[PDB]
Amino acid sequence: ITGTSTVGVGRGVLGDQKNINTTYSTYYYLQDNTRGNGIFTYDAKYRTTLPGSLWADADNQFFASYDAPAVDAHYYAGVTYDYYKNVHNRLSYDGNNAAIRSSVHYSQGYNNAFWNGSQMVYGDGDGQTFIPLSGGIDVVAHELTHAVTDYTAGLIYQNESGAINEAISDIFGTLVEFYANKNPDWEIGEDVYTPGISGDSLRSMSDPAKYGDPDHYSKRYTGTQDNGGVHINSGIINKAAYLISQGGTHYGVSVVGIGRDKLGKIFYRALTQYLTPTSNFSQLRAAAVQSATDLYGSTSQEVASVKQAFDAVGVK
Numbered sequence: 001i002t003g004t005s006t007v008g009v010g011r012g013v014l015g016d017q018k019n020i021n022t023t024y025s026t027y028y029y030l031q032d033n034t035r036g037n038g039i040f041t042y043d044a045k046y047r048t049t050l051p052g053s054l055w056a057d058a059d060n061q062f063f064a065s066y067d068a069p070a071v072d073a074h075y076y077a078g079v080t081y082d083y084y085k086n087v088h089n090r091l092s093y094d095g096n097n098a099a100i101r102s103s104v105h106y107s108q109g110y111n112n113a114f115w116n117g118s119q120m121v122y123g124d125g126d127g128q129t130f131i132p133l134s135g136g137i138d139v140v141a142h143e144l145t146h147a148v149t150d151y152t153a154g155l156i157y158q159n160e161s162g163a164i165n166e167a168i169s170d171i172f173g174t175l176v177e178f179y180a181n182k183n184p185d186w187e188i189g190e191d192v193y194t195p196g197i198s199g200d201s202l203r204s205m206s207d208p209a210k211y212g213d214p215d216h217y218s219k220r221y222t223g224t225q226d227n228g229g230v231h232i233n234s235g236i237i238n239k240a241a242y243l244i245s246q247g248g249t250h251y252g253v254s255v256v257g258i259g260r261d262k263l264g265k266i267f268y269r270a271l272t273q274y275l276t277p278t279s280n281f282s283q284l285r286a287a288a289v290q291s292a293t294d295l296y297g298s299t300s301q302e303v304a305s306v307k308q309a310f311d312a313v314g315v316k
């Protein structure tokens with residue numbers, strides 16, 4: 001809509017209070033004009049028709065429990081925008097400030113969120129397995145990172161290429177968690193998964209086998225479920241990103257950690273410069289080793305730790 005840039009306030013899924021960029025024209029719209037061609041948040045109103053209606057509010061106050069998922073979808077899209085702009089000099093998901101569109105209240109009891117090729121979609125969950133999935137900054141950053149991947153490497157959402165795709169989304173989901181610096185971790189979806197059970201998560205990068213995901217190439221899933229295990233074989237790359245950042249010893253291979261900034265730079269460079277739609281794990285190692293070499297030189301600790309990390313999860 002055409003209108004005035006303004007600042008509203010509301011509560012997120014977790015009851016946290018935050019300010020949100022709105023646009024005034026009769027109603028206050030969840031439209032942020034401060035970021036590229038803007039960030040727009042829509043109400044799917046418990047239906048599967050997309051995007052639904054641009055989120056509208058009479059008083060610019062978003063404190064109803066109905067409002068909570070919209071507040072987080074809108075705010076965490078902004079933090080994610082800021083991360084790619086400030087840390088990687090990237091303007092929105094397409095590199096040219098494309099409008100970022102989110103719909104919340106998708107379907108009834110929907111225990112998922114997705115990038116549909118055009119926009120992000122968040123369910124409310126059933127209240128048991130999930131609460132509203134926009135509540136997780138790692139979830140919002142994960143789904144918008146699918147958009148980045150689609151406009152860069154274009155990794156095919158199948159087999160090894162699909163697993164790298166899933167891994168990139170978990171890596172950048174987590175680095176956006178750390179950039180926003182609330183209670184960041186190396187787990188995926190802890191904030192919105194199983195509200196009755198504390199301490200658990202959907203997936204773990206630090207120890208993927210905790211949730212039944214392989215942490216070594218030799219334990220890879222080769223069946224057809226989950227498009228050839230895109231959410232499963234992602235553990236092998238997830239664990240490698242974790243060792244590169246934090247270090248550790250895994251099946252007796254020692255890796256010196258180089259921290260989150262360097263991990264980000266290396267994997268962003270691999271994503272935008274070397275990876276292709278059909279890239280496998282082996283070509284991801286080569287891409288990640290070339291990126292560290294470009295950035296830090298062939299003889300650096302940074303290149304050594306990428307090599308030791310890919311060695312540790314059994315990727316030659």
Ligand SMILES: N[C@@H](CCCC[NH3+])C(=O)O
Binds near residue numbers: 111112113
């Ligand atoms: N995003 C993962 C986990 C979601 C929870 C399962 N309903 C997937 O779709 O496989």
Ligand SMILES: [Ca+2]
Binds near residue numbers: 060063
């Ligand atoms: Ca209101």
Ligand SMILES: [Ca+2]
Binds near residue numbers: 183190191
């Ligand atoms: Ca957390």
Ligand SMILES: [Ca+2]
Binds near residue numbers: 184185186187189190
């Ligand atoms: Ca997390």
Ligand SMILES: [Ca+2]
Binds near residue numbers: 197
């Ligand atoms: Ca839980």
Ligand SMILES: [Zn+2]
Binds near residue numbers: 146166169
């Ligand atoms: Zn994903």
